[PDB]
Design a protein around this ligand. Structure first.
Ligand SMILES: Nc1nc(=O)c2ncn([C@@H]3O[C@H](CSP(=O)(O)NCCc4c[nH]c5ccccc45)[C@@H](O)[C@H]3O)c2[nH]1
Ligand SMILES: [Cl-]
Lengths: 112, 115
């Protein structure tokens, strides 16, 4: 089923885009939890990490490499936290795989 | 020594004990000694990478493999209601061991924000 992130990929609703390529999109989160809080998502609709296939390995790693490169470009020189949520207990809010990157403040422990 | 001399390199080489869940030629999954959830484990590469901010472009498949292994281990451990994956970078991220590691936390409701 389509999600709001599909609409963002298709440019049907606005988002503040940080980076795009042929296979992923990075954009600022609409409900930021840190001074910098953005998402990196694949253009392929994988609904949740639990259903990712083995052949998706390089794509998932691509999200992390894009995320760390975007974090550097956004000035997160003191560090950041990357998060993927799965399901109800994980607090997943949109059923399209999305890598959160949060920084610009001290991130605390436990991570939720 | 392959893997480095952080605690995680020692664990990779069986020089310090750990409760191992899964092991292959690229990574190792093992339980966290200070769990923050009823199930809390780590997935680490066997290749030493100090932190995600210095990972190389050719590390993409390895980093993705950590997540695939993480989700497969989570299923094997019965985390059917979900879980959260975390990577900490640098001081603001809360990094304390400079060997890349992916946390998997589940068995309770995780809250927002994630720290
Ligand atoms: N099985 C096992 N054996 C060990 O010898 C050992 N030593 C550390 N750890 C666990 O590694 C995990 C990952 S380190 P990180 O850089 O993501 N910082 C994570 C927050 C953080 C900042 N400072 C800290 C101090 C203590 C614990 C966590 C913290 C932590 O969650 C340790 O618990 C171990 N696990
Ligand atoms: Cl989410």
């Amino acid at each position: 089923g389509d999600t709001i992130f599909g609409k963002i990929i298709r440019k049907e609703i606005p988002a503040k885009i940080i980076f795009e390529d042929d296979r992923c999109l990075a954009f600022h989160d609409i409900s930021p939890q840190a001074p910098t809080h953005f998402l990196v998502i694949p253009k392929k609709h994988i609904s949740q990490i639990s259903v990712a296939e083995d052949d998706d390995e390089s794509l998932l790693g691509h999200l992390m490499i894009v995320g760390k490169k975007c974090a550097a470009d956004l000035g997160l020189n003191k560090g950041y936290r990357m998060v993927v949520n799965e399901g109800s207990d994980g607090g997943q809010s949109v059923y399209h795989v999305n890598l959160h990157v949060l920084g610009g403040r001290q991130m605390h422990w436990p991570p939720g």
